[PDB]
Design a protein around this ligand. Sequence first.
Ligand SMILES: NC(=O)c1ccc[n+]([C@@H]2O[C@H](COP(=O)([O-])OP(=O)(O)OC[C@H]3O[C@@H](n4cnc5c(N)ncnc54)[C@H](OP(=O)(O)O)[C@@H]3O)[C@@H](O)[C@H]2O)c1
Ligand SMILES: NC(=O)c1ccc[n+]([C@@H]2O[C@H](COP(=O)([O-])OP(=O)(O)OC[C@H]3O[C@@H](n4cnc5c(N)ncnc54)[C@H](OP(=O)(O)O)[C@@H]3O)[C@@H](O)[C@H]2O)c1
Ligand SMILES: NC(=O)c1ccc[n+]([C@@H]2O[C@H](COP(=O)([O-])OP(=O)(O)OC[C@H]3O[C@@H](n4cnc5c(N)ncnc54)[C@H](OP(=O)(O)O)[C@@H]3O)[C@@H](O)[C@H]2O)c1
Ligand SMILES: NC(=O)c1ccc[n+]([C@@H]2O[C@H](COP(=O)([O-])OP(=O)(O)OC[C@H]3O[C@@H](n4cnc5c(N)ncnc54)[C@H](OP(=O)(O)O)[C@@H]3O)[C@@H](O)[C@H]2O)c1
Ligand SMILES: Cc1ccc(Sc2cc(N)nc(N)n2)cc1
Ligand SMILES: Cc1ccc(Sc2cc(N)nc(N)n2)cc1
Ligand SMILES: Cc1ccc(Sc2cc(N)nc(N)n2)cc1
Ligand SMILES: Cc1ccc(Sc2cc(N)nc(N)n2)cc1
Ligand code: NA
Lengths: 249, 255, 251, 252
Amino acid sequence: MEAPAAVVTGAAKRIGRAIAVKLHQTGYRVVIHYHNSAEAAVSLADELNKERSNTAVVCQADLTNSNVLPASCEEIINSCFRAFGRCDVLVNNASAFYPTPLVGKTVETQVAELIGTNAIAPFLLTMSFAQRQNLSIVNLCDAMVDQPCMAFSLYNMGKHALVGLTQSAALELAPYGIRVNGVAPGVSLLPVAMGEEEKDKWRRKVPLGRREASAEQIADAVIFLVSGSAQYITGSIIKVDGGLSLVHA
Amino acid sequence: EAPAAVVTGAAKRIGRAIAVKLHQTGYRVVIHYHNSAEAAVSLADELNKERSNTAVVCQADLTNSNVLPASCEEIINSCFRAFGRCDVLVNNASAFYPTPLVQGKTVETQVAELIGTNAIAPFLLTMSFAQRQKGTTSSNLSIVNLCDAMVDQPCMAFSLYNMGKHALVGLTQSAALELAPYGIRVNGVAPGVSLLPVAMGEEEKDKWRRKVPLGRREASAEQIADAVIFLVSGSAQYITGSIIKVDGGLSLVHA
Amino acid sequence: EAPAAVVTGAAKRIGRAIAVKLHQTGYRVVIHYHNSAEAAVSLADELNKERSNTAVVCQADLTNSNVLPASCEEIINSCFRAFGRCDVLVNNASAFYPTPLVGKTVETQVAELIGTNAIAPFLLTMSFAQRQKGSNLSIVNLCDAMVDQPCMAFSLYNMGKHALVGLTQSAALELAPYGIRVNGVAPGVSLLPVAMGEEEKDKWRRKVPLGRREASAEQIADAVIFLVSGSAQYITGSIIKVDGGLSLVHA
Amino acid sequence: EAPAAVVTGAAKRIGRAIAVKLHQTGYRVVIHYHNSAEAAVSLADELNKERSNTAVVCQADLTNSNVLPASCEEIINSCFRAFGRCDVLVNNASAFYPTPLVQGKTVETQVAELIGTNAIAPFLLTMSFAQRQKSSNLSIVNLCDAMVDQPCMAFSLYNMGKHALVGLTQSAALELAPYGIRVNGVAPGVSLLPVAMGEEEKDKWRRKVPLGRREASAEQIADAVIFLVSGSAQYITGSIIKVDGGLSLVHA
Ligand SMILES: NC(=O)c1ccc[n+]([C@@H]2O[C@H](COP(=O)([O-])OP(=O)(O)OC[C@H]3O[C@@H](n4cnc5c(N)ncnc54)[C@H](OP(=O)(O)O)[C@@H]3O)[C@@H](O)[C@H]2O)c1
Ligand SMILES: NC(=O)c1ccc[n+]([C@@H]2O[C@H](COP(=O)([O-])OP(=O)(O)OC[C@H]3O[C@@H](n4cnc5c(N)ncnc54)[C@H](OP(=O)(O)O)[C@@H]3O)[C@@H](O)[C@H]2O)c1
Ligand SMILES: NC(=O)c1ccc[n+]([C@@H]2O[C@H](COP(=O)([O-])OP(=O)(O)OC[C@H]3O[C@@H](n4cnc5c(N)ncnc54)[C@H](OP(=O)(O)O)[C@@H]3O)[C@@H](O)[C@H]2O)c1
Ligand SMILES: NC(=O)c1ccc[n+]([C@@H]2O[C@H](COP(=O)([O-])OP(=O)(O)OC[C@H]3O[C@@H](n4cnc5c(N)ncnc54)[C@H](OP(=O)(O)O)[C@@H]3O)[C@@H](O)[C@H]2O)c1
Ligand SMILES: Cc1ccc(Sc2cc(N)nc(N)n2)cc1
Ligand SMILES: Cc1ccc(Sc2cc(N)nc(N)n2)cc1
Ligand SMILES: Cc1ccc(Sc2cc(N)nc(N)n2)cc1
Ligand SMILES: Cc1ccc(Sc2cc(N)nc(N)n2)cc1
Ligand code: NA
């Protein structure tokens, strides 16, 4: 059919959910990938299908690195083709985020989760996306990669690797007409359980309005990058951070 | 009431495309120019034919000098005089030519033109833009600087031009930080190769085109304008201090 | 009270020159290797001939797996076993080969390219830091000046090297309170791949503004020596490009 | 015989340390100064006491003006006159003060000083240095700033000048590589604090630095310059070495 289709990873909640909704509002059919949040994913799909029948499906997968991750990533892309006959956009949003101090989970599990979700799964999804082909990929990066959270080495390594993928894939996929870009939030949606006192500490550091980005503001940048208004843009990462990364210690 | 924009060096090429696209989006525009009077007036006539009293021209040299601050203050004042407001500033005007380090313009003229157009004038226009707002919620004020995706892999023998564009990156960042509390966003658009020089031969143009991964061709002026329009829009209201490369992957390509 | 250094992938090429220069500077060295056993033992022999009991070898595969943490721990332990201390870690070992997006399985390619270039450095950094509770301690990561202008079809490799820049920064921040500095050296073109043909090698050489030639291994090693030295005691989280201007050259 | 170096702004603080360490390494030195004649001569006297006729001074204002090209030519010429050669240029002199965007010196004077010292003078000195050349180890070292991407509030012009200096470093490295002239930078974070800065403010800055919660000594900055001019950096050009104790890694 004539409406384009997008895969959004980690789409049940928060930023991924807002991205899925905005893509849907723009006219895309969506694959809502999720790991543990089945109820939320299904709720979103039902909402979107109420708006337009047969325009949303869910796809469950763990994006932890392992021997089966390549197959899992191939399956996610295939789900979009099975549902909608095409796959125009891939949004790599899903992400593990927790500290891994240099000095519970084994360290190999932490590597698998943090590097898998933030870098390896994006790479494998990118491979599967390209092999099956205004086509574009958008990677959710992090404006703070050069001024990282203390004791978040593996997470930071994963997001750095994702910048490399964005560049490498933009270069390699350009001949196929597939653009590859990034959106780099600073502080957006905070953890719900984070105390407001801690939330406000982060908010007050942001020059532009002393507030976090909404999920919708992050989604707006993704929508620009997949649009016809970005058709010469490839290998670019758009910071959406309210000036946070410009603020010295 | 429609918002108003100043676009420097807007008579032709990329600056014209930005002015046109802003005007199509609903802005009133000040078309600043230096030598290209006929082209500036022609553009303003076309825009005014589309919507009466929505375009004016403003002449100024943006070469650095002791009067440049007054010239820059006057450009911003022209927008307020014509339209009663100034919501957007686009720093597009630019001198571009080689200044070899080893060997009829004096070097001091070259510094004045290359650093003036690309960096000092943007700074002064930024100051004047910000100061004029002090006499004013639904507002959406911003500045867009035309940067250069190739600043870290520069053209051979273009040191002063390169220095000017690096300075413009610094201004983008410094002004984003300092003007955020006033609700003025400050961002950049960094072309790779877009409209090639008028005097460049076709063989040389094709040499540049063939290096671009995405389509083996230069950006259209409209493609560059699209990124400016995004940055001024409500879809970018949390974006400040960002420079969007619009280069078809050119900067990713090794030697 | 000679300090001791671990250099990964030290049997040949750049890692060998690093081990040699560290030894010349007065370090005792652990020559880590994977497959190049003969070269590793030959080097240790040369170094021990110069100063007895100053070099040992340590074999390990640095491919990512569930045993990699134990392997990395063992490398660091080998330094303490031999020398009773470990002052310097040089993360040099590296897999480098294309992985196009469009008979190794992709999972093996991920494990080798991301393991050697990023995960092993991380685990070795962890083990190095945790063994320190007893100076001029530092870590040097061999990065790549071309990470932002990467080789076509080397996505996994490039991801690994980007991850290595992240580790360098993150570990510099986190280990600064323990006095452990963490920096990088980023070659452009240095010793060319053994499998590369002469015409192709010459193509790469001609790209380099400063002398139209590749860096020697000794030139790369000179920057490592500086970073571990007393003349770099306030330097942490810095990556020194050693590329003859190659990265400045547009397409 | 011995190589020769020009260090701008060499009478005090970081520039003085750089000149001292180059001299100790075996260089003859031109000590450039603007207002600090007494300190400049005191340094030369100290260095000449160590090795006769190995240090001279050169006065010049590095503010941008119509005479700045001539002034920069003279600084380079002074090295050739004293020592018959000029192997190293260190661009250290620098104006540093706020220039707020929203509201003493006029703005154009502030442009002349901040952009002149931090960028235009280095460009003109680079040009003169290269023109006068056209085995050897010729290089230029620019004193940059590790904080350029997380700048001081209200320091737009200073920041623009330092960004321009990054651009010069890269452009000149590319263009001068065929002549065997390397061009690099050293980027301090917090080193010797402003003389006017209050002691409590100094401590606020010190406590931000991960590596030792202190500023860099001038000698530590000089150590990186020494490396860059040495034979141990013969393949290094277009590189900027941060010497910041991890300060630039620390988020807000
Ligand atoms: N929030 C911010 O301030 C911020 C700042 C910088 C960057 N970003 C980036 O923006 C993106 C969105 O951020 P966010 O805060 O919305 O993310 P988030 O809530 O932390 O995580 C998004 C989703 O990732 C999925 N996920 C986590 N582990 C997974 C695994 N092993 N396999 C498959 N999926 C997994 C989860 O899906 P299920 O719930 O279904 O399990 C989760 O809902 C992320 O890439 C993040 O790094 C966010
Ligand atoms: N074209 C590209 O491929 C490319 C690549 C990278 C970056 N960019 C950037 O994008 C912007 C637009 O590029 P472009 O090619 O359209 O620019 P351009 O044609 O070279 O110049 C734009 C205008 O700048 C004005 N200008 C030059 N010197 C001036 C002075 N002393 N005072 C006042 N105005 C002066 C001229 O106005 P008058 O004609 O009225 O005299 C000219 O029409 C520039 O900032 C440029 O650096 C372009
Ligand atoms: N050469 C250059 O032009 C260049 C350019 C940019 C960056 N670099 C970086 O500089 C460093 C040294 O470069 P180089 O060319 O000397 O490296 P190299 O020869 O390609 O590799 C160095 C050593 O890495 C070891 N290694 C490879 N896979 C391994 C594995 N699975 N487990 C354990 N060790 C493994 C090998 O040891 P065994 O031989 O014992 O098996 C090999 O001898 C690398 O990090 C490289 O990425 C080099
Ligand atoms: N100190 C730090 O923490 C720090 C941090 C980042 C970067 N840096 C950089 O490191 C370098 C040295 O810093 P510093 O603190 O030692 O510098 P500084 O004391 O502020 O200035 C050094 C010298 O610059 C000269 N100078 C200033 N204006 C001049 C002019 N118009 N004409 C000619 N010379 C002029 C002065 O010479 P006279 O005294 O003879 O007039 C002054 O002594 C500078 O480039 C600076 O930006 C320093
Ligand atoms: C201060 C703060 C802000 C947001 C979060 S959620 C988060 C952040 C991130 N970079 N990646 C993912 N996946 N989730 C946690 C702490
Ligand atoms: C390869 C090429 C492409 C476009 C141009 S026009 C131009 C370029 C620029 N960076 N700034 C200005 N002002 N004009 C010249 C050469
Ligand atoms: C142009 C060129 C020069 C040297 C090599 S060898 C090499 C390079 C690399 N970046 N990592 C490793 N491990 N080995 C390959 C290509
Ligand atoms: C936190 C701090 C530390 C040192 C200074 S002195 C200074 C700094 C600079 N960047 N340039 C020059 N020329 N002088 C000012 C503030
Ligand atoms: Na780039």
